[PDB]
Amino acid sequence: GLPEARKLLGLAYPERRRLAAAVGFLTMSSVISMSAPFFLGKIIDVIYTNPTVDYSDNLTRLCLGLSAVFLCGAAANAIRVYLMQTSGQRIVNRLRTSLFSSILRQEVAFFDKTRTGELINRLSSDTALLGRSVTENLSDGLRAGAQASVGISMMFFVSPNLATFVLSVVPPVSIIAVIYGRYLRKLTKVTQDSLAQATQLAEERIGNVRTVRAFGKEMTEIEKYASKVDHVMQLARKEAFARAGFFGATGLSGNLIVLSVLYKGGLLMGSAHMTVGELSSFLMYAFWVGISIGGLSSFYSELMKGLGAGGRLWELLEREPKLPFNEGVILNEKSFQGALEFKNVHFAYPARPEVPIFQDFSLSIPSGSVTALVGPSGSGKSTVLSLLLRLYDPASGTISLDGHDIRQLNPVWLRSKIGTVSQEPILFSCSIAENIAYGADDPSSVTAEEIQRVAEVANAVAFIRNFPQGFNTVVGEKGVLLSGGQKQRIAIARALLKNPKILLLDEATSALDAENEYLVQEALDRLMDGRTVLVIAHRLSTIKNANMVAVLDQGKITEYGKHEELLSKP
Amino acid sequence: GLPEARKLLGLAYPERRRLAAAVGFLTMSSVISMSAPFFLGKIIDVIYTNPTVDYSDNLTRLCLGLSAVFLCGAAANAIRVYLMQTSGQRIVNRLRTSLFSSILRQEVAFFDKTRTGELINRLSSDTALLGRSVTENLSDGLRAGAQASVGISMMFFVSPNLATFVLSVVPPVSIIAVIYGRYLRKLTKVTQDSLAQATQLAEERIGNVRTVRAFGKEMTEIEKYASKVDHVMQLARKEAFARAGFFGATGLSGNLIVLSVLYKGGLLMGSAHMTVGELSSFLMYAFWVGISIGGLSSFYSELMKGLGAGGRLWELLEREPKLPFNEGVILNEKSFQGALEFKNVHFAYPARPEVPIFQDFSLSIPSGSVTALVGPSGSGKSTVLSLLLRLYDPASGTISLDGHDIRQLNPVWLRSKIGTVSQEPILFSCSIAENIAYGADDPSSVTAEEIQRVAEVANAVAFIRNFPQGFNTVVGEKGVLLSGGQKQRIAIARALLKNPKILLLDEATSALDAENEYLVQEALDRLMDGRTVLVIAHRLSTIKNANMVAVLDQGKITEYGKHEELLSKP
Ligand SMILES: CCCCCCCCCCCCO[C@@H]1O[C@H](CO)[C@@H](O[C@H]2O[C@H](CO)[C@@H](O)[C@H](O)[C@H]2O)[C@H](O)[C@H]1O
Ligand SMILES: CCCCCCCCCCCCO[C@@H]1O[C@H](CO)[C@@H](O[C@H]2O[C@H](CO)[C@@H](O)[C@H](O)[C@H]2O)[C@H](O)[C@H]1O
Ligand SMILES: CCCCCCCCCCCCO[C@@H]1O[C@H](CO)[C@@H](O[C@H]2O[C@H](CO)[C@@H](O)[C@H](O)[C@H]2O)[C@H](O)[C@H]1O
Ligand SMILES: CCCCCCCCCCCCO[C@@H]1O[C@H](CO)[C@@H](O[C@H]2O[C@H](CO)[C@@H](O)[C@H](O)[C@H]2O)[C@H](O)[C@H]1O
């Protein structure tokens, strides 16, 4: 309501001087324009009164004068439109940057409960709506509002009898038409509800054609759908009958209302209360009020749509992340060794809080050691990485870095010290070089020599240069699809460029081939060297060579020790 | 072109009598309507010539007569709209059923290369377009075409000088405006291309916020996006300048063209070549031609859109499935025993033809035996089920049922004999009872007693009745979410109701809990009894108890025999 309009006020505020200039051009053009029916009525009565008089010179002067008025009106409109559009574009730009900045500051839990599609609809559609609502739509309502105001005033000035008549007739007709319109909307909802059901059934059955086939139900589904769409046709016929009636009734009413004005006006002329010019003026103003009422109606719908968008954008713009974005301490070179400690950690994902991942999880990972995490569910093991990068906070317990609770540190800084290599790595739809550069604190500051060096160590340089575009080859989803081994080696190149003291590896037991597996293992060994390594082990070789082995069973470290001492225990 | 219009012809053909009646009402209304500027010009000249004459009785008779004309016109419009809408609805209904029927007849390979979203856009949007293109849009172009035709003819009848003048002036202005319009479209594309890039970047980075966080790149992405949207603003300002110029130029040109007609017309009146009424008639017809040109323009855009839709729908309607839908033999009771044979089967999925799944795969599954399929990739093992249900055909080799190549049999029938229980079952968004009933050849013919019986055997009846709605509980995605064990037991209830001689089980090694695992194993044992079972084994108990064990290595049966004889072999 009142604080909503206050937010729309401040939104247009940085552009107040452009919008004021444009409103000034809009007022000038709209009010000068409103004078034409009045002056046309005077000319109509002049021709009527004097049919024997030569009007060539007046006409030539008037048409030369009107040319000049039209050139001015065109210049004023050009300026007004440019000022309005550019004002909106600046507002939408400020909405895009502000909205994107807030979204990326939110905790992972927020993304867990919010769909990417909805956030993109807010960044696309809602920013467009909100931007034009305080500009184009505000100008549109302002013109229509002034033109109904001037029009109605001019109808009463031209003839207080005919204006009072129109004002007594239109409202009852408009009220009845609104009630008929609301009925027609309900018959439309009934049809579109039924059509939505049929389309959802169709979508489900196409999407699960393998299950449909498997049970020999293609013919059944075809007949089911045919029954649903035959019922839609039944509803659509009822709707069509009500729509035909409405268009007939509103059309007749519109025509008869105009006819009544021509008839009452015709009689007022005969009785000398009015001239033909005066009636012409009245009808032009009445028609202009009609259009202006339409304009105010369209302005109200777009204002409500823009306020709807406004509520959705102020929701994210004002959202305070439930986890700090760039806040906390940084450790010095002397104190940062890369030792990690889990102490009585309890955790369940925000989306599935009913499923406990950790239940009193304690694990001590000393500096420069290789600790192999072993256990049943990989969901539990993979969650360790998420908590170490503080994507989430434990429900209970603490995670410490060199004795410091990771909550007391700058999360951006914490993450710069912890590198990761996934079973299935994520590469953005940009060049290989940009993807590798991403590892650096400053990816625009990396040299081609640094990118090439880590690409050699990661055993990635040969397949990259074997691309026609080389390091300029656009990868990701929207680009060139890479093999699992190729994606992993670029992930290792990125890790090497990051150069973290702590490394978290998730071993890929799902897929690896004779050619890739060798060059990936060789690169992973070079990467693992001189770093605190936490590895979700699947390969027997990494478990035997690891300094320690941790058994994760039902979200707790049940057994911990060297691989050999673990075989002789149970 | 010519065969395209021939298809649109036949589309409207079943509704030819409704559409003819509506066109008749459209022609009547449009041609009677076109007479009003002519008759208004005569009345204008009558008032002008006789200002001293009482016209009250003529006006009252004319307004009573026009009331009757308006009541007729309203009735004709109501009928015309109803006939047009209902004709389109019948056409769209025939397009929905025909299109859905063709889609579900297509082989699984088709769905492998076609997105569900695209098929739903063809069933939603394109059926709507095509249906209104031969109805509403055809009527719209027909009215506008007749009204430009009558209008232009009437402009020449009213004044061949002024009509020739307008015809010499509008085309040069229209050509120049088209060239300026095409330029403005290119500046718009440049802006919207840039905006699409920025939005895609935003979508990717929001969608991969975990990777962005992990490398401390939230601030980098925010600044990257801000750079892209600042560049969009630069393009949008250039576009805004060209749009402002175009609206200024087209506005001025429009106004000056009308002014030229008022001036030339004004001079023709002075020289006695025309009357005020005649000029009024001419301007009304000129304005009506203007609107009609707009109407023909809108009709051409919608005709092209509808032809675009038409090409996409005739593509699927005329597509011949690359695998038979409901064609082939059925075996008798005596000859159907449920014995299966794979002979030198070679296969690679249509989407990934570079990856061979089977390379000379041969496996003999005798009637009433339990064969356990064991091996590395589960992708290979799961493909056996797809080939047995003939969702695909082998590239080489044969699959036989009781000595008959499954290609020679009716695939619907073949599938009625082969049941399946997946690790992750598929349940539609309908009642539990409807989901269970799906197993039957006639799911509407199953009794509540039959559904309850299989639900008891499947150990499903207790959790189903423990639902507030019971067997009426809507499950699937759009409904009540069930546990893995609950979904599996309903899958077993459906299998029991199907009562197949052959059963294909995919053992769920991913998830199973102490409570579910017992009741699911008990139900699976009752289901496995007296049937030819092929089980993708993960549980050691099922491999030891199985009649035979088949080792699948690199898409071939490397070792086959009893579990004990297999341990002493390598
Ligand atoms: C859905 C559509 C609904 C439309 C409703 C139609 C309503 C009918 C319209 C009737 C119009 C004619 O209305 C008629 O106007 C004249 C002229 O002002 C009035 O006539 C009276 O007042 C005028 C002055 O105003 C005097 O000159 C005249 O001598 C006197 O008789 C009539 O009292 C009135 O009945
Ligand atoms: C569908 C219906 C379409 C018809 C629309 C309504 C037409 C009404 C019928 C004709 C009534 C004629 O009414 C007549 O008009 C003229 C012109 O204004 C009036 O004339 C008055 O104004 C004109 C200026 O236009 C002066 O030149 C004249 O000295 C003055 O008396 C007459 O005093 C009046 O009697
Ligand atoms: C972007 C907008 C472009 C708009 C272009 C504007 C073009 C200029 C319009 C000029 C209109 C006036 O055009 C003028 O009309 C009169 C009246 O017919 C013509 O006049 C001539 O023919 C008429 C008959 O038709 C005779 O009665 C008259 O005595 C004779 O001089 C002039 O030869 C012509 O020049
Ligand atoms: C922005 C410009 C707006 C103005 C639009 C154009 C107006 C032109 C200027 C006035 C010219 C007046 O021209 C004058 O019109 C009248 C009315 O048709 C003509 O009169 C003719 O028709 C009328 C019927 O309407 C008859 O009653 C009359 O007997 C007959 O001669 C005159 O012979 C002509 O000289």
Tell me which of B38, B40, B47, B53 to substitute to probe ligand 2's pocket, judged by most ligand atoms within 8 Å of the beta carbon: B47
Closest CA to B305 of B83, B142, B129, B498: B129
Secondary structure of residue A494 in the 3-state scheme: helix
With residue B341 as reference, give the H or E element that holds it.
strand B340-347
Question: How far A84 CA lies from chain B's nearest CA (Å)?
Answer: 9
Between CA A99 and CA B97 the distance in angstroms is 44
Single-letter residue type at A422:
S
- Give B555's contacts (C-beta < 8 A, 6+ positions apart): B356, B357, B358, B359, B360, B361, B380
B277 C-beta neighbours (distance < 10 Å), count:
22
Q: Quote the ligand 4 centre to B177 CA distance (angstroms).
A: 34
Count helices and strands in chain A by DSSP H and E runs: 21, 10
Annotate B439-459 with DSSP letters as a single string: TSSSTTT--HHHHHHHHHHTT
C-alpha angle B225/B226/B229, rounded to 5°? 85
Q: Tabulate helix, strand, coil % of chain A (nearest 5).
A: 65, 10, 25
Q: What is the DSSP letter of B420?
A: E
Alpha helix stretches (DSSP H) within B208-275: 209-214, 218-270
Q: Given CB atoms, is B355 within the 8 Å cutoff of chain A?
A: no
- Burial (CB < 10 A; 0-12, 13-18, 19+), residue B289, is buried
- What CATH fold (topology level) applies to the domain A1-333? ABC transporter transmembrane region fold (1.20.1560)
Chain centroid, CA A523 distance in Å: 40
Q: Which ligand lies nearest the alpha carbon of A42?
A: 2
Rg over alpha carbons for chain B, rounded to the nearest Å, is: 37
Which residues of A, range 117-156, sit inside 8 Å of B by Cβ? 119-120, 123-124
Q: State yes or no: A378 annotated in a binding site.
A: yes
What backbone phi and psi angles, to 5 degrees, belong to B559? Answer: -140, 140
The CATH number of the domain covering residues in B334-570:
3.40.50.300
Q: What is the DSSP letter of B37?
A: H
Between CA B362 and CA B369 the distance in angstroms is 17
Query: Which residues are paired to B182 by β-bridges?
Result: none
Between CA B370 and CA B534 the distance in angstroms is 6
SS (H, E, C) A278-319: HHHHHHHHHHHHHHHHHHHHHHHHHHHHHHHHHHHHHHHHCC
Crossing angle between the packed helical segments B514-528 and B448-457, to the nearest 10 degrees: 110
Q: Which protein residue's CA is at the shortest distance from atom 25 of ligand 1?
A: A268
Closest CA to A79 of A137, A25, A12, A16: A25
- Give A560's contacts (C-beta < 8 A, 6+ positions apart): A363, A548, A549, A550, A551
Between CA B179 and CA A478 the distance in angstroms is 35
User: b/e per residue, A87-103, with b = 16+ CB within 10 A?
Assistant: bbbbbbbbbbbebbbbb
Under an 8 A CB cutoff, do A104 and B478 touch? no
Between CA A479 and CA A486 the distance in angstroms is 14
Q: What is the DSSP letter of B342?
A: E
Closest CA to A536 of A423, A340, A372: A372
B435 C-beta neighbours (distance < 10 Å), count:
26
Between CA B345 and CA B388 the distance in angstroms is 12
Between CA A137 and CA A417 the distance in angstroms is 51
Taking the CA atoms of residue B300, residue B301, residue B306 and residue B310 in that order, the dihedral angle to the nearest 10 degrees is: 90
Under an 8 A CB cutoff, do A97 and B232 touch? no
B123 C-beta neighbours (distance < 10 Å), count:
24
Q: Which protein residue's CA is at the shortest distance from atom 32 of ligand 2?
A: B51
Quote the tokens at residue A392.
């989430």
Query: How would you classify residue A317: left for phi > 0, otherwise alpha for psi between -120 and 50, otherwise beta?
Result: alpha
Quote the tokens at residue B22.
């509506």
Q: Indicate where chain A has its CATH 1.20.1560.10 domain(s).
A: 1-333
Between CA A419 and CA A439 the distance in angstroms is 9
Between CA B199 and CA B304 the distance in angstroms is 29
Contact call for residues B523 and B516 (beta carbons, < 8 A): no
Q: Which residue has the tokens 């001189």?
A: A530
Q: What is the DSSP letter of A335?
A: T
In Å, what resolution does this model reach?
Answer: 2.8
Q: Indicate where chain B has its CATH 3.40.50.300 domain(s).
A: 334-570
What backbone phi and psi angles, to 5 degrees, belong to A370? Answer: -105, 110
Closest CA to B469 of B516, B426, B434, B520: B434
- Give B436's contacts (C-beta < 8 A, 6+ positions apart): B451, B454, B455, B471, B490, B493, B494, B497
Quote the tokens at residue A359.
């239940």
Between CA B449 and CA A268 the distance in angstroms is 83
Contact call for residues A88 and A131 (beta carbons, < 8 A): yes
* Pairing label, strands B404-405, A404-405: unpaired
Which residues of B, range 403-462, sit inside 8 Å of A by Cβ? 412-413, 415-416, 420, 426, 428-429, 438-439, 441, 443
